[PDB]
């Protein structure tokens, strides 16, 4: 039956409307693979015909318009919208010729002008179903030119005669006549399809008097009001973009000039710095000042009471003053968009009580933007980075990757989405832009988008996502200090959620050698990290022993893993953070089980025995299983990092002579904590030697299988750091077994045949890092 017959056959009308609703549902939120199927069921013809059909009923007219937007448009519309709120501006020669007011000072039409803001293009894919038989399926294409002119033509056909007051509505009501067409036009505008002439037609249609019984004047319902609110919002956003780009253009020209006087002045000084020693010798300064302060001092003449700061010529600062006046004029500080919006909104409000809440919100958002333009400029300026013309395509790759990333937070995470995010992250890293312009990635909210993804996944299934994300965040940390600080705020989350790489690595990377951040460590965070060690002092991960394992009581596995974070958090830049010292040992002793199964208190056992355990039970593989890991060496790692953390938490010598009862009592806590003697024991507890000869074998022990030499190095560090060595007797004692025989082993490994082995190298680092410097220290 002819479809227009679904105007009296109401049951079929409702069923078919809901069928279209279901179509939009299955295609919703980026599902292009299903969008292609819907192309097959509803074609690119039927869509256009339904759009240009007047006799079709409402619930089907709106249904088909929204279906068109869902199948083809609202997957490039949302992405283009997400990236609309940032203002990267390439310093092209084209962008230089952008002035707020077109030359001739009256407002140019909004959204009609060269805009060089660096928005990336949106890709499509022809839809054919005969192709042979995943990479991201792009949205189905559609001729974006016949569609554009067609939308404009039907909008014209629906506007003025729309106000002909004819009781002929196109679709059963004024609402069903306008709402869909305006929806389509606003979507197309946001996509960046409309040229300049088409935009002029749209503006002439909205309000012909000011932009040259229009559209706003005629009678109107509420939903249509909301749609014009969206359109005018788009044009206001275009005007804001224009202000920002004009600021960028003036910035370019004004700084290309503002350097010229700096070089000229440097030449003037070099020719005449003499004759005025101590008179200009103060004025020659500001050339050794950091550059941002230099710029601030350069641009410090507005107040006219600070005008001495600026050494500029008068004309140059006049350039800035004139630009400022023009900016104010453009910002308002009818006959223009601002007054039109204001009067329109007030008239709507004062002619009827609006029951649509979102309509009210939209109205007042526009009103606020049209009374305060300078404020929105100041709130948009934080998102403004002027990239060089060369680095432009790299930014397109970056922005498309970011678009895919933030276009997956709207979809629950399966395997395909997992692979796509992991590819996107890798593509983000490889851009040299990521290295060169960290401020931009902080500006785009990158470390927040990726954080949000990680929060969603952690809030486990898909562990590789957490691994990839945390590696990305570690690189973000490492890139520059301001990023470190940036993510230091989330450290509460990044720590409370605690496999290779882990979010705890992110938390540690936040504070690697940054005194400012290291000190700022809140105490409760230090507990949170001592918890999860208290949280792992007496436990064995069920997630570890899923295979045959000895199933020991305690779990050093998580232990050392947490310990290293503290090690970073206490000792930085080759010295201790004694400010964050008492917290460390105090908190460790409040949970006196954290010092290991040994050194608890009552029931505590010999430290030499504490390692003798591993000395025996680790070296035999009879206990570990019938390959992930081996034991003991991780136990030794625990009993290493504990001592390293405590040693690092030691007061410095000049602070010892400070008589700091805090520092001295901390020394006492350390001294009662482990006996001063056991040191020489663990220093002297010997470990195996590489496969010297042995029929040329490789019986050289695996590191993960043999004793942590750095365990003994940490021992030495603790020894020389709090206990110290003060007589030749104890030095001799250590040399007897702890030092000299280790040197014999090392230089025995010095053979070209058995030096490349890892054990030799590790012993080399061990002797170089802690043994030899100590021996130098005790030489006098």
């Amino acid at each position: 039956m002819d479809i227009l017959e679904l105007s009296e056959r109401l049951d079929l009308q409702r069923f078919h409307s809901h069928t279209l609703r279901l179509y939009r549902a299955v295609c919703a939120l980026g599902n292009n693979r299903v969008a292609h199927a819907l192309c097959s069921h509803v074609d690119q013809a039927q869509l256009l015909h339904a759009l240009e059909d007047a006799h079709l009923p409402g619930p089907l007219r709106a249904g088909y318009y929204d279906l068109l937007i869902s199948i083809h448009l609202e997957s490039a519309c949302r992405s283009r919208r997400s990236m609309l709120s940032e203002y990267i501006v390439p310093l092209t020669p084209e962008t230089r010729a952008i002035t707020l007011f077109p030359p001739g000072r009256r407002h140019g039409l909004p959204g009609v002008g060269v805009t060089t803001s660096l928005r990336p293009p949106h890709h499509f894919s022809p839809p054919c179903f005969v192709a042979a038989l995943a990479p991201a399926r792009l949205s189905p294409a559609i001729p974006l030119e016949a569609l554009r002119d067609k939308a404009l033509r039907m909008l014209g056909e629906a506007v003025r005669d729309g106000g002909q007051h004819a009781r002929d509505p196109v679709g059963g009501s004024v609402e069903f006549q306008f709402v869909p067409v305006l929806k389509l036009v606003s979507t197309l505008l946001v996509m960046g399809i409309f040229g300049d002439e088409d935009v002029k037609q749209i503006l002439k249609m909205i309000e012909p008097e000011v932009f040259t019984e229009g559209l706003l004047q005629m009678k109107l319902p509420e939903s249509v009001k909301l749609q014009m609110c969206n359109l005018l919002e788009y044009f206001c956003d275009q005007e804001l973009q224009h202000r920002v780009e004009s600021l960028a253009a003036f910035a370019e020209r004004y700084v290309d000039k503002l350097q010229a006087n700096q070089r000229s002045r440097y030449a003037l000084l070099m020719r005449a710095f003499t004759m005025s020693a101590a008179e200009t010798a103060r004025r020659t300064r500001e050339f050794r000042s950091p550059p941002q302060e230099q710029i601030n001092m350069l641009l410090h003449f507005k107040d006219e009471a600070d005008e001495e700061d600026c050494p500029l010529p008068e004309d140059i600062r006049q350039d800035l003053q004139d630009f400022h006046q023009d900016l104010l004029a453009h910002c308002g500080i009818p006959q223009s968009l601002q007054e039109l919006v204001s009067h329109m909104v007030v008239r709507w409000a004062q002619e009827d009580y609006v029951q649509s809440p979102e309509l009210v919100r939209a109205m007042f958002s526009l009103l606020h933007r049209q009374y305060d333009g300078l404020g929105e400029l100041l709130r948009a300026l934080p998102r403004a980075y002027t990239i060089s013309p060369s680095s432009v395509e790299d930014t397109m790759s970056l922005l498309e990757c970011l678009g895919q990333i933030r276009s997956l937070l709207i979809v629950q995470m399966g395997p395909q989405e997992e692979n796509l995010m992991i590819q996107s992250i890798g593509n983000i890293m490889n851009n040299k832009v990521f290295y060169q312009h960290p401020n931009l990635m902080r500006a785009l909210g990158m470390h927040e988008t990726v954080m949000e993804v990680m929060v969603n996944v952690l809030g486990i299934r898909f562990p590789k996502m957490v691994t990839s994300c945390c590696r990305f965040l570690c690189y973000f940390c490492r890139i520059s200090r301001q990023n470190q600080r940036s993510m230091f705020d989330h450290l509460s989350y990044l720590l409370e959620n605690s496999q290779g790489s882990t979010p705890l690595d992110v938390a540690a990377a936040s504070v690697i050698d940054n005194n400012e951040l290291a000190l700022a460590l809140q105490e409760q965070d230090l507990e949170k990290v001592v918890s999860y060690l208290a949280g792992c002092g007496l436990q064995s991960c069920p997630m570890l022993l899923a295979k045959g394992y000895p199933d020991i009581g305690w779990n050093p596995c998580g232990g050392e893993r947490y310990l290293d974070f503290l090690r970073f958090a206490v000792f930085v830049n080759g010295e201790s953070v004694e400010e964050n010292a008492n917290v460390v040992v105090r908190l460790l002793i409040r949970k006196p089980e954290c010092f290991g199964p040994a050194l608890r208190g009552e029931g505590g056992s010999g430290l030499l025995a504490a390692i003798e355990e591993a000395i025996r039970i680790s070296e035999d593989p009879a206990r570990d299983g019938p390959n992930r890991v081996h034991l003991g060496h991780a136990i030794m790692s625990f009993y290493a990092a504990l001592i390293d953390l405590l040693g690092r938490c030691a007061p410095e010598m000049h602070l010892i002579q400070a008589g700091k009862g805090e520092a001295l009592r901390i020394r006492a806590i350390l001294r009662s904590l482990v006996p001063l003697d056991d040191l020489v024991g663990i220093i002297s507890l010997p470990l195996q030697i590489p496969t010297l000869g042995k029929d040329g074998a490789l019986v050289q022990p695996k590191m993960s299988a043999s004793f942590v030499p750095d365990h003994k190095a940490s021992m030495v560090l603790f020894l020389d750091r709090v206990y110290g060595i003060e007589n030749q007797d104890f030095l001799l004692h250590v040399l007897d077994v702890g030092f000299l025989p280790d040197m014999r082993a090392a230089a025995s490994l010095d053979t070209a045949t058995f030096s490349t082995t890892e054990m030799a190298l590790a012993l080399n680092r061990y002797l170089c890092l802690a043994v030899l410097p100590l021996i130098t220290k005790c030489a006098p």
């Binding site: 292609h36 690119q44 039927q46 054919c128 179903f129 042979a132």
Partner: protein, 107 residues
């Protein structure tokens, strides 16, 4: 396999070959009678080059037997068609395809 039903006779002298680009306006259907895709509705001819397996093998063979300017009607059995999986959401499994194709130009 595929078949050639000469709905309208083309030229018969020239045929598509290796490394040549063929353009078609194909309207297609299931065997029951339902229609899945039509270039004609999209309004743009479909292009492909005999050889690199753009399309299912069957469509390629069928368009290879054809002449220039010859409408026809291919009948690709499932094996030379999408096959047991079927195009998800469009072609049901193990379905036979019928294709009203028309080789317009051979470049």
């Amino acid at each position: 396999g595929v078949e050639i039903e000469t709905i309208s006779p083309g030229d018969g002298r020239t045929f598509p070959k290796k490394g040549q680009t063929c353009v078609v306006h194909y309207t297609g259907m299931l065997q029951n009678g339902k229609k899945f895709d039509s270039s004609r509705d999209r309004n743009k001819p479909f292009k492909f080059r005999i050889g690199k397996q753009e399309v299912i093998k069957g469509f390629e063979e069928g368009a290879a037997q054809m002449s220039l300017g010859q409408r026809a009607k291919l009948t690709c059995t499932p094996d030379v068609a999408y096959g047991a999986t079927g195009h998800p959401g469009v072609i049901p499994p193990n379905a036979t395809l019928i294709f009203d194709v028309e080789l317009l130009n051979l470049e």
